[model samples]
Every structure is written in structure tokens, then in C-alpha cells.
Target: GPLGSMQIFVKTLTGKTITIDVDHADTVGAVKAKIYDKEGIPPDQQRLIFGGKQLEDSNAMSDYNVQKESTLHLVLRLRGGV
Candidate 1:
């Protein structure tokens, strides 16, 4: 493929970190899907923050200008009611 892949480090709110490799063309949602598999957190429940900006699901990794070994902070979106 013309687009290369890069590794991203995601830190969960619980202080757990998970590494994921993503294609430069892949969307943020794609990353969330992978996290869902590992952490059981739904894609909609994920809030990815990097470089002081929030990642948009519909945007490609390149849109954020992310690079290999970049770190992302994952915050679980809390549900209301109770």
C-alpha cells in the first residue's frame, strides 16, 4: 500500500496503556474499534485525545498529523442517569 502504518500508544484513564498499529489512511474510529476488542469499551464510549486535541472518528490519522510512537489519552464517556 502507498500509505504506511504507524504505532500509537493509548493510555486509558485507569493508567493502563495499549499499543496499536494503524495505517496512516485509517480513521480514528478504526482505532476505537480495536480498543473495543481489547477493553470492551464501545467505540461511542471512547474519547481519544492527542496533542491537546480530540480525535474525530471520521478523520484519518493523517488529518491529525500523528506520527509513530505518538501517545493518545483515552477517556471513557460516562453515561448519564441513575
Candidate 2:
């Protein structure tokens, strides 16, 4: 579980801020799970992106070389539709 790691700055829609220590081998799904645990956002509903690329699959982290100290952006999908 050490393919790589990164520290992402989590900014809530409410203007709250947080930091997380995550593994590089963790895929978008894994990151979503972490967000769910911390931000209470459902994993299936969370979206993670890095370097302008949307993360996909649980193994993309390893393939993408998402190492520690990297920066990521996480977006929470709304539960209700417009």
C-alpha cells in the first residue's frame, strides 16, 4: 500500500479546511472512502482530481504515480438533482 503518497488540502464548500495523509497506491475510490470517513461524503458520490485529471479506479493512484506531497482536489457531488 505504498506505491506513493500525497498530502491534500481539503477545503469544504462551507470554507472549512483540512489536511490528509494518504497513500499513493490508493485509487480515486480509496480517496473517496477517506473523504467519506472524514467529510461524511459518500464514496460513490465523491470526485477526486489531480493535475487537472479526474482520478478513476482504485488502482489509478499507483499507475498515475501519485506520490506523497502531491496536491489533489476533491469535489463532493450533491445528493439532490437540479
Candidate 3:
């Protein structure tokens, strides 16, 4: 079981830090969806930057030393033109 869930922060481009509750066992892919659940932004339309690198969809938080209270930032996206 993935015990010891933690709280983390995500900084949106709005300069606002969005707090998220997570389990270290969850992958970045799922994290994106979790954020989506809160913010209504689809997974494909968001970027999760942690550990000074772009997070790959399937990589778990611990895979990059992402930890409790380790704040991650976002890169913005829209559904329209590239």
C-alpha cells in the first residue's frame, strides 16, 4: 500500500500556489489528472515541472526526489492553436 500521503504545492502561472494532496506512489500522469479534477484543465493541457525538469507522464513523484511540501510549478496551456 502507498501509505504516508503528503501535501504539495503547485504554482500556476497566476503566481498562485495551488495546494494538492497526494500519495508519493501516484505517478505524474495521475497527478496531472488529479490537478485536472480540481482545476478543470485536461492533462494534455498542463505541464508539471518538478526537480528543475519537465515531469514525464508516468514517473512517480519519488522518482525525481519530489517530496512532501516540495512545490512544483506549471507551464500554461490552452486547447486552441499551438
Candidate 4:
């Protein structure tokens, strides 16, 4: 049984368009990187992860196996450490 396709509505930094059809298996961080690629923002300037979770590596997509059942939420940065 093959899993169905996944789609995501991603908002570019330019606020011009929310692209769709992105894979769900991609980690929240990877998603941001993709946006940066399209939007021309440096990866070092922005931090992101799924569901606003703070992770040490923004490139932790390899840490987890992305599958059809995964839901990747994204947060651009973390705040309020206290």
C-alpha cells in the first residue's frame, strides 16, 4: 500500500505566495531552508523547527525519518529563554 502524497502551504519571506505540494517528511528546519533558498535569505540569519521546538541543529532532518504519517510544523526562531 503506497502512502498518499503530502502537501504543505509554505509562506515565503516576501509574503508573496504560499507554495504548496511540499513533502511532509521534510523537517521544519528543512522547510525554512527551502524558503531561504527561494527567498534569498542566508541560512545563518534564521533559525527554525517544527511546532516551534528548539533544536540545536537546524539541519536535523536526518535525525528523524520523515514518513507519510509525519506532520512537520515550523517556527522561524526561539524566544524568551526565561
Model number with the top TM-score: 1
Computed on alpha carbons, the lDDT of every model, listed in order, comes to: 0.76, 0.61, 0.72, 0.48
Candidate 1 TM-score, true structure as reference: 0.77
Off by over 4 Å in 3: 1-3, 79-82
User: Model 1: per-residue lDDT, tens digit, 1-82?
Assistant: 5568788888876778898888777888888888788767767866887667777875547586667887778877655421
Q: Please list the residue runs of candidate 4 whose C-alpha ends up more than 4 Å from where it truly belongs after superposition.
A: 12-14, 47-82
**Model 2 accuracy (lDDT, Cα):** 0.61
Candidate 1 residue pairs that clash: none
Q: By the TM-score metric, which is better: model 3 or model 4?
A: 3
Q: Give the per-residue lDDT digits (tens) of candidate 4, residues 15-44.
A: 444443445355555665676677566555
Poorest stretch of ten by lDDT in candidate 4: 73-82
lDDT of 2 by residue, 1-82 (tens): 5354476665544455667677664665666567667856666766666666776776446676555555556666665532
Kindly list the per-residue Cα lDDT of model 3 for residues 5-80, writing each as its tens digit: 7767778666767778777677778777777778776678778776678878765565755567777788767645
